[PDB]
Design a protein around this motif. Structure first.
Motif: not given
Lengths: 321, 901, 519
Positions: A91, A95, A149, A151, B146-148, B150-153, B156, B369, B372
């Motif tokens: 990802p 991204k 980031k 994971i 902060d990130f979350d 699946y990998g994102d902010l 956005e 995926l 969660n």
């Protein structure tokens, strides 16, 4: 570390001055690599991740397309070594593809070479900072600060029953009290209490499937299940010791060195081993309480951890019983 | 009355319609020609011998429809239902009643969605708009950064994903809305420094010792504007998110700061919903002509937990039961294992609370995926007590897109039981007999007398938005403030409320109130129509019902001769005192006098035309004395006590009779609008965007507003027109009503504009927000009050500098954009306010300069080669800042071209 | 799931000139499906000289996957190919070629190809499954000089995948001498999960390929006394037949293996049970103790120095064979290795001496399970009566919850209900009798081989459920089920609760239970 990278590259099916062009940041992927992977980089199936094997390992790849007048199609690639896990980068690559896509869609960025030349120290900073701490907060434009980031992606969890006893392996005070979910704040004062239908109706006052999936997410991070501590043997007692009855069995089965029926010989056979390889606690009726009702420092970690740093004894009772 | 259906064998669809009384089959037709091009093609003649006649005692329990670019009221929905009692319903039907329109959709029967069917008298109806008003708020906490999963902010994810999906679905379904987008947050320790005093609230727990000083920051993007092809707002929001934390941090108090609180640490959520209510409650003050629905979307990146004081919570309950607008969503994902809209009582085991009045929804992105997790984690370096949060069934809740892309109007007819007997105390009835008299307005006396429109019983609004300090980060409203203390005082105790009214002929109504549910009772015009209209303007506010070569129109003639007065601008032996023969033999030549006939006016001739004639033949300023000599015998008006009529450019509408009528007080929810008349010049409007670059005051007319022949009701509006002369100044008409159908008044104003553009000069509706803060009878919490300083850089001199302010004002007049002194109508006219010509810009003239704001009431029509195109307003802004701040030689040449004389 | 949804073959640039798909519609060596029919190149296809498929089912995008892997498959160099594309797809293909200009390092026409047989899964396999599919495709694409259009061996393996979840094993499982477990643990990944090549390379000790397969043959183109000493108790001659059938001929094995294959009935029943669902027991010692005739001084040395350094000099430096030499050296070797298997192997009178001296001196005993022998192997320690037996893992049907009299949940003596001498651990015949009583003859072994699905209930309890559901204290509950076997009301009082399995309870049924028990 999660994964190990070594090289990043950019490529494009560019018009007739150069058919297939590349930028590289270092492995040195030579003529052979680009001949052996060049059919991969043109497809009507776009905006999709693909990774393939190769001699040096695995390249990962993604494409997208725009500017249909003298058609535009290009490709980010990200090449590492194979024989590891190497499955936590995907990802992040998708991204970065989204970052480059929105950057082109609102700035018209790569219509000239000088932007692509400015795009090179971006590769240097990302190639270093992924290996540094796995996170990138870098302003590339006035409208894009890229945030990245890594994971670790801790693997799949088991199924939790409700006759179970959980034990938090670490300690409680390593976390903010203010930073949990509220169901976890409603249970976490009572975790070292042993069985589950006791804990829910004794302090949690919650619903069964809710606490079962919540503890399954805790197992997905940091707790280990085991079975209850109903006293099966009684004649395990008469060898003298120091305080290894209530805590010891939960600890030893969290260290996974018995069969499930602890019986009336397993504990003493392990006890004399620990004894030479080194009044009542109401020894009857912990079980009439088993429903809902409306040294000087405690020694169950010291000697076992001082062992557990080594491995000869972990052989000697990991082929246990 | 007879009922046909007509598929063939083996088909998938079923088609049914009605017409009148087949029993012997001989005379019939296909009832619709273009139902071919509606649904399904075959040749449209009379005879195929296929078509089965049906009894059809099978109903359709819920039907829906949508509106596009139109304003109505739910009383018009009631009469739509009343003309819609016993008729057909096929999918995608356009239908019309009483001049207004509808487009059908979403008709269910009990399990299934049925394409074609019949509706008679016992179904139910749902009215939705795709022409509504949406206010979307974006909370920003410590977790947007902060990130979350699946990998994102979260930023956005929220903005890019949710807003991109919603704007693509809006573009697909082709709606129209008035959006406001407000970005907001809070900060801590903004304690004390001058010019930043008025902005601090204090968070305060009543026993545990925490009280600190905090503030909430707002910033609006695009304020109030409809425009096609959105999603550039995403780009602007991205840029503002990058420049946002310095816009929070290096301002007011550089002591120790802490911005961007968590959602569960503190929170300004419910306050922002409260101010959305304190915008929507005063929706009746500048009423739109094309927009009905109201929608408040609040986006949080939080979780569903908020903590708030009980008082304003109860206040928002008693304000939300009135009108239903509020919808929450969370762009966090990860729906947690408890009753997810919830509140900790931030009071003055902790006390838990759930709302049931709010539609929650949760976002999830497009990636698949499995496990969660429902938990966060952070490593440290180092007498009821019946509800907990858990035992509800909070399994899976989606987005509810249909409640997001088509806002629904309020419930009309719901279910509750009467107040029979016993403890119920207060009762008031009113009987109302009127008289045969037509020398209309008498319904207003019972209208004011019965309720006084929630008169002495009130609806409770203690939210006093007094201060708003703003910053010159970008041009729209950036206020950063404290919202004023809640002036709470509790209404009625231990009492119900019931009314009744009656016309002793045939009509009774009953009226319960803590919410206004009604019980109608049925048994030159007909009295049931007056009864239905009385129920209508009981509904209007809040209305829950129980269930089981000329043209002599009055204003237009004065308007067209008023057009004629600048259309031409840009005898026997004389001095004889008789002048009688000319005074009745004007019409020898082709002199325009309307001396034939009209109702209430047999002998028509207006004095401005007489001044045209005897300035064509007699002299000009000696006119008034000989006009007094004329007026000493002949008359046009009623009784004089004046000058000889009025000589030049003076304004008299219709309604000759007023003497030998009842009023509208300012506290019973009057609908009113304002229109202005301005003078244009188009040959400078083309270089505006082209290559050149740099006697009482009011008079009240109760006009019967119809060009049709309806014979249905009476329907009037009270114009308050102000004007006296209008050389080149603005000319205003107040429009008040609390009365019958809206769209007919809209098409009357449409005819006024379409007569104003060609053959005359121009007309534009103006938002009646003068340059005024909140906590007023007028006012908005989103008006920036854009100051512009007038730099200079060199007895009774204040009048003199005011004069040269006016001189540079009308010089900015002379260049491209002329001015008009809007001497508005409620008395004493505090500061000079100027409307610019044919555009969207307003000024008031009070340290250094003067202040400026917009019109939002243009709305992509009212258009010639003059108006529209918001970049023109941006051009006038930059043009006046360049002409204002002593730029290179421009005020220099202004001083020379002033002091030359 | 260890499945495989897609196996597939394609065509773009086969290395030939005639009689194939290039110019006409698709047609190749000994096959003519001309004029663009429903395109047999994928898995689900009924095949004859004429063949028809279905093109319907892949849960996702379909033909872009096909018409992209047409060229994503091919390359110039040979070897492996793994392709994890998106979120839920992995492609696994390791093809080759064989093109030669008449050098030979049958054939009918030069039908040469850059062939592309490849089969896949989705993203969640196992590593040995991955490498087994690797060597599986490797044994598929050896040479294949049955040069036809024949895809039925591909469908044979396809149906082997969908029908079977644990592919190859044996009915004939053998022995364990003194060296075979670590002899097995040397390779551990060679070819196809195969005890056949395992026993062959153990016994004859020479890598010969009478080519071993699953079901279908592919092509590239001594009587021993240690073994028979380890198998005079159990099953020698089928293994000698296997020796003959891997030193003489190939292609005729499973029709020659399975036809060749109170006290005696329970003996063959429990040996079938051990052939399916039963585990072993062993023991050993340790010489380790450290704190502050030959009890103390050697132990003090052990406290300060490891023994094989110091004391292993003195037993040849003073020339001493005795009981103390037997204390030294076989204790040292059993401590080196730690089963009781060398203590029963290396024996002259050492058999009754090792446990004698082991309980004599204060070296610590332990009893445990056989040394690392997983159930991915055949057996440890061929059968004699001197050793005990239990069972751990095997799933099982139910005795208590559906209201039966002979109650047997899972407690100590796990199924808790010369005259049966040889085993001190009775749960072997507890489990067998609780399957079925030993008087039935065909149904005995039929239930031994039909505990798959176990008489058709399936498992929901392992004794924790009772105290889990209701107010059952453990000693109170043994007071119950040590005498529940004799009247239906004593079991019925706690098993009547379908009237609260109408459920409507949501907390616990215990109040209505202890009220409605007694009279």
């Amino acid at each position: 570390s999660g994964c190990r990278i070594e090289c990043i590259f950019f490529s494009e099916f560019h018009p007739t001055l150069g058919p297939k062009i590349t930028y590289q940041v270092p492995l040195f992927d030579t003529v052979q690599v680009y001949i052996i992977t060049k059919p991969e980089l043109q497809n009507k199936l776009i905006t999709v991740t693909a990774m393939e094997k190769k001699l040096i390992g695995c390249p990962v790849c993604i494409e997208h397309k725009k500017y249909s007048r003298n058609a535009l199609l290009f490709n980010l690639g990200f090449v590492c070594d194979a024989q590891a896990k190497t499955c936590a980068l995907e990802p992040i690559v998708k991204k970065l593809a989204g970052y480059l896509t929105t950057l082109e869609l609102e700035s018209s960025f790569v219509s000239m070479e000088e932007s692509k030349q400015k795009l090179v120290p971006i590769m240097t900073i990302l190639l270093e900072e992924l290996n540094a701490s796995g996170r990138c907060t870098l302003p590339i434009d006035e409208s894009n600060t890229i945030h990245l980031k890594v994971i670790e992606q801790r693997p799949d969890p088991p199924v939790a029953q409700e006759y179970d006893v959980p034990v938090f392996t670490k300690d409680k005070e390593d976390f903010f009290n203010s930073q949990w979910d509220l169901t976890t704040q409603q249970i976490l004062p009572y975790i070292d209490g042993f069985r589950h239908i006791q804990k829910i109706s004794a302090e949690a006052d919650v619903e069964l499937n809710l606490v079962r999936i919540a503890i399954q997410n805790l197992l997905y991070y940091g707790v280990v299940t085991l079975v209850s501590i109903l006293q099966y043997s009684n004649v395990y007692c008469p060898t003298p010791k120091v305080q290894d009855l209530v805590d010891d069995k939960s600890l030893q089965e969290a260290c996974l060195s018995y069969v499930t029926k602890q019986g009336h010989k397993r504990a003493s056979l392990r006890d004399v081993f620990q004894l030479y390889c080194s009044q009542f606690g109401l020894m009857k009726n912990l079980i009439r309480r088993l429903q809902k009702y409306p040294y000087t420092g405690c020694h169950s970690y010291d000697e076992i951890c001082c062992k557990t740093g080594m491995s000869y004894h972990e052989l000697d009772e990991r082929l246990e019983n | 009355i007879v009922e046909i259906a007509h598929p063939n064998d083996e088909y998938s669809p079923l088609l049914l319609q009605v017409k009148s009384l087949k029993e012997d089959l001989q005379k019939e037709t296909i009832s619709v020609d273009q139902t071919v091009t509606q649904v399904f093609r075959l040749r449209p003649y009379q005879d195929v011998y296929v078509n089965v006649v049906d009894p059809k005692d099978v109903t359709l329990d819920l039907v829906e429809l949508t509106f596009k670019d139109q304003y109505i009221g739910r009383g018009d929905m009631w009469r739509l239902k009343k003309s819609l009692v016993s008729t057909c319903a096929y999918i995608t039907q356009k239908v019309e009643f009483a001049g207004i329109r509808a487009q059908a959709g979403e008709l269910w029967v009990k399990n299934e969605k049925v394409m074609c069917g019949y509706i008679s008298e016992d179904t139910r109806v749902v009215f939705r708009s795709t022409s509504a008003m949406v206010y979307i708020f974006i909370q920003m906490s410590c977790e947007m950064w902060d990130f979350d999963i699946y990998g994102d902010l979260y930023f956005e994810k929220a903005v890019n994903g949710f807003l991109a999906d919603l704007f693509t679905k809006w573009k697909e379904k082709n709606c129209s809305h008035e959006v406001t987008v407000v970005l907001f947050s809070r900060t801590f320790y903004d304690a004390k420094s001058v010019d930043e005093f008025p902005e601090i609230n204090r968070a305060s727990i009543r026993q545990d010792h925490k009280g600190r000083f905090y503030e909430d920051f707002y910033k609006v993007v695009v304020q109030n504007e409809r425009r096609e092809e959105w999603t550039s707002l995403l780009v602007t929001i991205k840029k503002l998110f990058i420049q946002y934390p310095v816009l929070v941090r290096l301002e007011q108090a550089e002591g120790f700061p802490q911005g961007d609180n968590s959602t569960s640490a503190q929170g300004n959520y419910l306050e922002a919903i409260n101010l959305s209510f304190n915008v929507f409650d005063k929706h009746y003050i500048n009423r739109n002509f094309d927009r009905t629905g109201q929608m408040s979307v609040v986006i949080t990146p939080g979780v569903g937990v908020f903590e708030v004081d009980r008082l304003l919570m109860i206040l928002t309950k008693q304000r939300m039961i009135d009108n239903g607008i509020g919808v929450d969503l969370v762009c966090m994902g990860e729906q947690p294992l408890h009753a997810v809209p919830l509140f900790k009582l931030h009071n003055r085991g902790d006390d838990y609370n759930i709302p049931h009045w709010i539609n929650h929804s949760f976002y999830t992105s497009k990636s698949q995926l499995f496990c969660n997790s429902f938990t966060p984690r952070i490593k440290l370096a180092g007498t009821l007590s019946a509800p907990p949060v858990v035992p509800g069934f909070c399994c899976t809740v989606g987005v509810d897109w249909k409640s997001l892309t088509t806002p629904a109007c309020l419930p009309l007819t719901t279910d509750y039981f009467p107040d029979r007997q016993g403890l119920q105390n207060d009762y008031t009835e009113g009987c109302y007999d009127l008289l045969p008299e037509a020398d209309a307005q008498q319904v207003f006396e019972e209208f004011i007398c019965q309720r006084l429109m929630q008169g002495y019983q009130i609806i409770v609004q203690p939210k006093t938005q007094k201060p708003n300090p703003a910053v010159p980060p970008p041009l729209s409203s950036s206020p950063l403030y404290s919202r004023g203390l809640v002036s709470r005082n509790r209404p009625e105790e231990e009492d119900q409320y019931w009314l009744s009214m009656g016309r002793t002929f045939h009509k009774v109504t009953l009226k319960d109130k803590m919410i206004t549910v009604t019980r109608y009772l049925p048994k030159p015009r007909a009295d049931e129509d007056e009864w239905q209209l009385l129920d209508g303007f009981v509904r209007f506010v809040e209305g829950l019902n129980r269930i089981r070569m000329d043209s002599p129109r009055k204003d237009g003639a004065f308007f067209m001769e008023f057009v004629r007065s600048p259309r031409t601008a840009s005898l026997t032996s004389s001095s004889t005192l008789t002048e009688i023969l000319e005074a009745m033999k004007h019409p020898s030549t082709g002199v325009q006098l309307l001396s034939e006939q009209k109702g209430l006016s047999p002998y028509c001739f207006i004095s401005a035309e007489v001044v045209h004639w005897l300035v064509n033949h007699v002299e000009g300023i000696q006119t008034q004395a000989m006009a007094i000599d004329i007026m000493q015998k002949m008359l046009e008006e009623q009784l004089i006590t004046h000058a000889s009529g009025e000589a030049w450019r003076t304004f008299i509408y219709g309604f000759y009779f007023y003497k030998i009528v009842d009023d509208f007080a300012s506290f019973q929810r009057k609908w009113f609008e304002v229109a202005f008349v301005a003078e244009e010049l188009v040959h400078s409007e083309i270089p505006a965007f082209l290559l050149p670059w740099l006697v009482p005051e009011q008079r009240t007319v109760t006009l019967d507003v119809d060009v049709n022949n309806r014979t249905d009701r009476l329907e009037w509006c009270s114009c308050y027109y102000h004007g006296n002369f209008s050389l080149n100044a603005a000319f205003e008409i107040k429009l008040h009503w609390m009365a019958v159908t809206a769209a007919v008044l809209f098409e009357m104003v449409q005819g006024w504009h379409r007569k104003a553009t060609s053959c005359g000069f121009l007309l534009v509706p103006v938002l009646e927000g003068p340059f005024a803060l909140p906590s007023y009878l007028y006012g908005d919490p989103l008006r920036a009050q854009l100051f512009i300083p007038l730099n200079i850089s060199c007895e009774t001199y204040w009048d003199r500098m005011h004069l040269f302010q006016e001189a540079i004002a009308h010089r900015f007049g002379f260049v491209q954009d002329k001015y008009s002194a809007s001497a508005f109508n409620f008395p004493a006219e505090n500061k000079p306010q100027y409307i610019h010509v044919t555009g969207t810009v307003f000024l008031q003239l009070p340290r250094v300069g003067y202040n400026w704001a917009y019109n939002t009431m243009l709305t992509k029509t009212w258009r010639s080669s003059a108006t529209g195109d918001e970049k023109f307003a941006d051009r006038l802004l930059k043009d006046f800042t360049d002409f204002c701040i002593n730029r290179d030689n421009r005020l220099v040449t202004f001083w020379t071209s002033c002091l030359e004389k | 799931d260890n499945t495989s949804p897609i196996s597939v073959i394609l065509v773009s640039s086969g290395s030939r000139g005639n009689k194939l798909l290039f110019r006409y519609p698709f047609q190749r060596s000994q096959e003519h499906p001309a004029s663009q029919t429903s395109k047999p190149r994928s898995r689900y296809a009924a095949s004859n000289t004429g063949d028809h498929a279905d093109e319907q089912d892949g849960d996702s995008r379909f033909s872009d996957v096909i018409l992209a892997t047409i060229l994503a498959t091919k390359s110039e160099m040979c070897g492996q190919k793994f392709e994890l594309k998106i979120d839920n797809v992995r492609f696994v293909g390791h093809p080759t070629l064989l093109q030669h200009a008449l050098g030979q390092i049958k054939r009918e026409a030069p039908t040469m190809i850059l062939f592309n047989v490849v089969f896949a899964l989705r993203a969640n396999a196992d590593p040995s499954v991955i490498n087994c599919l690797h060597n599986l495709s490797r044994r598929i694409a050896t040479v294949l000089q049955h040069e036809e259009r024949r895809c039925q061996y591909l469908t044979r393996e396809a149906k082997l995948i969908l029908a079977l979840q644990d592919e190859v094993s044996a009915m004939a499982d053998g022995n364990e001498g003194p060296q075979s477990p670590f002899h097995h643990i040397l390779p551990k990944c060679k070819l196809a999960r195969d005890l056949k090549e395992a026993y062959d390379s153990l016994c004859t000790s020479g890598v010969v390929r009478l080519h071993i397969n699953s079901w279908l043959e592919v092509s590239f183109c001594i009587p021993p006394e240690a073994i028979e000493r380890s198998l005079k108790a159990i099953r020698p001659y089928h293994a000698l037949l296997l020796l003959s059938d891997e030193k003489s001929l190939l292609g005729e094995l499973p029709i020659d293996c399975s036809p060749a294959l109170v006290k005696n009935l329970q003996q063959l029943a429990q040996d079938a049970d051990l052939a399916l669902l039963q585990v072993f027991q062993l023991a050993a010692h340790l010489v380790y103790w450290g704190k502050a005739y030959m009890l103390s001084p050697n132990a003090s040395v052990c406290l300060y120095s490891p023994l094989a350094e110091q004391f292993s000099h003195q037993f040849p430096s003073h020339d001493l064979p005795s009981v103390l030499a037997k204390f030294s050296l076989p204790v040292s070797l059993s401590e080196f290795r730690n089963p009781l298997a060398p203590a029963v192997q290396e024996t002259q009178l050492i058999q009754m001496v090792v446990w004698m001296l082991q309980r004599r001196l204060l070296i610590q005993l332990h009893t445990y399970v056989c040394l690392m022998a997983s159930p991915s192997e055949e057996e440890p320690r061929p059968r004699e009566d001197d050793v005990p037996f239990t069972a751990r893992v095997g799933g099982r049907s139910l005795s208590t919850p559906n209201a039966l009299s002979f109650g047997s949940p899972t407690s100590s003596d796990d199924m808790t209900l010369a005259e049966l001498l040889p085993s001190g651990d009775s749960p072997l015949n507890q489990r067998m009798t609780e399957n079925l009583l030993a008087s039935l003859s065909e149904h005995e072994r039929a239930a031994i081989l039909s505990v798959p699905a176990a008489q058709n209930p399936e498992d929901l309890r392992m004794f924790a459920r009772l105290l889990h559901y209701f107010r059952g204290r453990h000693h109170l509950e043994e007071i119950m089920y040590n005498e529940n076997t004799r009247r239906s009301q004593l079991l019925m009082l706690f098993d009547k609760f379908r009237s609260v399995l109408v459920v409507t309870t949501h907390e616990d049924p215990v109040i209505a239970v202890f009220q409605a028990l007694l009279p």
